[model samples]
Target: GLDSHELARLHELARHSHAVITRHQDAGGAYPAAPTFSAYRGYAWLRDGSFTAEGISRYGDVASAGRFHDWVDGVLRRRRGQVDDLLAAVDRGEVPSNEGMLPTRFTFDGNDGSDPWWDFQTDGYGMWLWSVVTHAARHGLDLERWRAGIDVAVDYLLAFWDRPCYDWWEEHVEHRHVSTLGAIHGGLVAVGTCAALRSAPWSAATLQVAARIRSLVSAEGVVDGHLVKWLGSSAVDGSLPACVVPFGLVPPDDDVAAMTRAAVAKDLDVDGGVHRFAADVFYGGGQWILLSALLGWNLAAAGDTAGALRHLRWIADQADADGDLPEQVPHHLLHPGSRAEWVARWGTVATPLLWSHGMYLILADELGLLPP
Candidate 1:
């Protein structure tokens, strides 16, 4: 246990995390990625919101997470016809273009965040499904509230999970990413295994595709016994630990899981903060708060309490005077030369990046730091 002073600070950050996320949550229940970041204003990503909702849910704010899930449900329900049409196009042997895919980001009102930006990612849909199902199970809530959305997401993933697309970072349009597959697998398995969600005809199919994902990763996604950034790559990504802890790309005890944890730590982590990848130049490739927590979460689940606490302390140290955490910290920058250009474009890095706060809550909760 932490000393009283340290414990008080940890509890304070948890409260602030809950406050900053709920305070900016859209009326439609979308949790905006970074409310003030230029490219992200007014848009919510399923990848971000679902994780944010996980933090809020773990923080025990039932209604906040509930609202975010409902918002995603309505968004998916509205896109049901679009997914059906795409599946029909698939049946007709038409290859789906990236432009035709349902977007990862949406306007708070549930419309497509219609822009020419990179949009063809499916990980978020999977994350939302997993988040909602996991949250429902955690709280003993009914799956009926999200039935239509689950159906739409399951149909969409089943049809397209094998297709090459973007990973969580929205890069690489040509390769099937392992992390993306893991997120989809997590969602499918969550809904697929639940007795309450079995009425959907596709429930069993969810398990089938999930097994296929596992098989694909086993055959192609492994390098030196650890998961890679994407299929066919030899590099490790910071997001890989998420697969071990919550996503189940591999179980936490799997030797592959330990190799991945070490691979990421050796390559991308500086002290305790984690970088997305070695090639990443985003904001000078600084360490990400969320990635650290993700690794910490994996460690805690594996019974490495001291290792988890190290990351929790690192994250706590990143909080600003007002207790906000940024998207990435400037310390231990991988590409210091590239930092200024991004600052020129997006202004400074995103402070109070809700994802950062959300992840801190997750790690803090993992370490038994959340207030009772």
Candidate 2:
């Protein structure tokens, strides 16, 4: 569907994206959200890094992806004591609040990075488990390399999988987001069925909790026929498609999956750009590069190659002169009036956002652009 020149450009951009991610990855192995973005600088989110690691792993940068996982392993290993304490408290019927859960973002050294900025997200922990397990399987690596981390995450989720927490965007700390639950469900299932982890002490509980998460989402998270942004909310978010594709909340051919794709395309997609949510005002609700790539990735998985290609081209078109992709593009703003204030507050949008490029690589790979 692309001209020779456009195809060449995408290939070059993919290489650049891979290079940018590996180059900026901290020596300690954390993937910063954006290398120089004022607000997000000097922090690594498991949510963003796991997705970034998946792209690099697909691009054949196994060493880099492994190091990122190593970083996470060390981080989680240190939390084993804290996890034990929390579990003990629960045994005593002193269940801790959400704040007692794990922090969402961490420094390169894996310490708490930001100051209570909507912390206590279970999705990232679950996402890391899923990412690491998938990476291990993809490259024939031993799951033992990250087994401790997986154990800690599985334990944490088994204890708190149903708790209301922040969504992937780090907003709405009070609502139980379907995307969040979908992420946890995928992670629990990943470890539960992993032949390598079949002997782990928590394997049975892992699968059991996963089924519970799925059941909960089915009961309360679906609205009409598609998954909603959060329980009791009718709006769809760009992240919803992920539940169907990589995360396996449902197969793409299922009715709910089809309805969700239609809901997102009709409500959030502008041309090929996808908005985060209907009421998003962050960066004036511009089209997110990662979100567009996410939808395209799902489309490819669902056998909609043409539809997927359209989004891939849109993402490619958003790259700047240096072929760097930003966190979002303003070609079609959902909330134009709020744009300037955010620009003034956070400066320009984050360019060379590692997660944006990472998602691009994922979609490109899904489209069968095998690595050079």
Candidate 3:
């Protein structure tokens, strides 16, 4: 357990994280990935915002969480016709191009933020379902608040969970990522088992799709007893342990979960800093604060409190003088040669990344230090 002062520091950081997220959240309720990052500016990603919302929900900021879910619900509800069209196309055996799928990001006003960036990713939709349902459950709210959006998400995922899309990092559009599947698995299960959704026509289908996702991952996503970066790769990724914890590809105590955790720690973690993957070169392949917290989350769940704290402390150490957490730290560089080029192009790493701070709060809460 943490000492009095140490716990106080962690609590303060969590509160700061909550403030950063809520303060920068758009007036229209969207949470920007990074408020000031050159590449991510003017965009809100459901993948990022959902996790951000999860942290705020855990921190007991019910209003902030509700607003974010409202924003997501409105956005997805507006896409109901699009989803229906896609489902209709599928039924007609006319496969739509990936570009015709939902965009990964949106402007604060809830429109496509950029020109086609080939960002047809389903992980965000799945993640949003999981986040909102978890938030609603935690706050004892009725699921009907977001039920329409949930229907849209569940249908979209059921129709295309097997389709290849971008990974959590928005790369590898041609491959089926295990973490992406894990997110969808968690989201579907979250809604499937919800008491409110039990009456929906898709309730049974949600669990069916989730079970299918688990079976598919088990059949093709594992290598050497551990989850891989994608369906066929043998390498570990920082995102893999998430499958074990919040995502539940396997329970934290399961053998596959242990193997995936060890693989990630061995291959991607360095002195508590976790890299995206072995081949990642974005921002010089620096260790991500969010990845460290994610691994720490599984560590805490696995009863490795010491290991988890080590990573938590490492994250706290990386905060800037103003207590801003960057997307990643340069203390370690998997591809040092590529650091300068990205810095020159993207204008340094994303500072005050909402996802980074959100992950910090989540790990802190998991360790029972939420209120210090």
Candidate 4:
């Protein structure tokens, strides 16, 4: 774990223009962009509410989390107001169905989408909301103040838990993304078990939902004893590391987890920094800040404090000139032996994303991963 100063530094790094505000556009309470971005450099012309909300939760920035919640709720609250403007478009014949993701980048006047409801049944949004609720419960944030919005958000997600929608990668509608489903289940657990927030055994209800989600994961998410990012896909995604959050809710078989642990330690690990996946697709991307945080925290949680230290040291050494983590590091730098590929690879350079630092904070908090 990091020492007190390190944690403070991490928090400070997370507060840049990109960390707290939507730098690209002044959209209606826009959430953070997907893949845990840095420097407020938004991804996808389409603004994904699901990703934005999840980013807020993972980072544990109470103020930003609250702001995101307000944005999500504002849209869901009014029948004909800004919140419902998009949903109304969905209800009407204005836009195509299932196009709920809607672009919120650069275009803040809500002019980005040709029609409202750009994407649909985004399981991540619900999970993000659940995260906010749980964070509030844990950190003394007010859930009731935002319960109406979250209720609608959760209700929206529940509407399609069994239905098929876009997965975490946001591609391939044919198969359910394990990341999406896992988050759905994980979010419900937060909604259900946040004993600190509400009464009436919400945990039991939410856990039941989680149980159902696990059943899907068992039949579809896990394969050959390793966690698959999506159903019917053999490609191992580094984002799969994010799934560890929900796995804590329902521990998988030791054998399977061990396999996953090995994968993380092997292919995904780049000189201690974690990469999105081993495959050199896209940018031949380097290691991700979120992955490193997860590995460090997870190792510590497993009582391997020393191993956790290794992860911190590994990523800390790889930090860029700004001392901020990127979306990826140079894949080749980690392994100079791989000559089969000649393209230059850059690592995760997203320094402004709060979630990355939040993960670091969590890892440090867990197992006392931080040094005194």
Candidates' TM-scores? Answer: 0.98, 0.98, 0.98, 0.70
For residue 244, give model 1's deviation from the true position in Å. Answer: 0.8
Stronger candidate by lDDT (1 vs 4): 1
- What is the alpha-carbon lDDT of model 1 when measured against the actual structure? 0.90
Regions more than 4 Å wrong, model 4: 1-31, 34-64, 78-96, 100-121, 195-206, 246-249, 252-255, 278-280, 333-351, 367-372
Clashing pairs in 2: none
Clashes of 4: 30
Q: Which is superior by lDDT, 2 or 4? A: 2
Give the local distance difference test score of model 3.
Answer: 0.90
The runs of at least 3 residues in candidate 2 whose Cα sits more than 4 Å from the true structure, single-residue gaps closed, are 115-117
For model 1, residues 101-212, the per-residue Cα lDDT tens digits are 8987789999889542365888988998889998998899998998889889999999999998877888898998988999999999998999997778987899999999
RMSD of 1: 1.0
Candidate 4 displacement at residue 183 in angstroms: 1.1
Q: Write the per-residue lDDT of candidate 4 for residues 90-121, one digit (tens) a residue.
A: 46756434555432232222243222232343
Using alpha carbons, what is the TM-score of model 4? 0.70
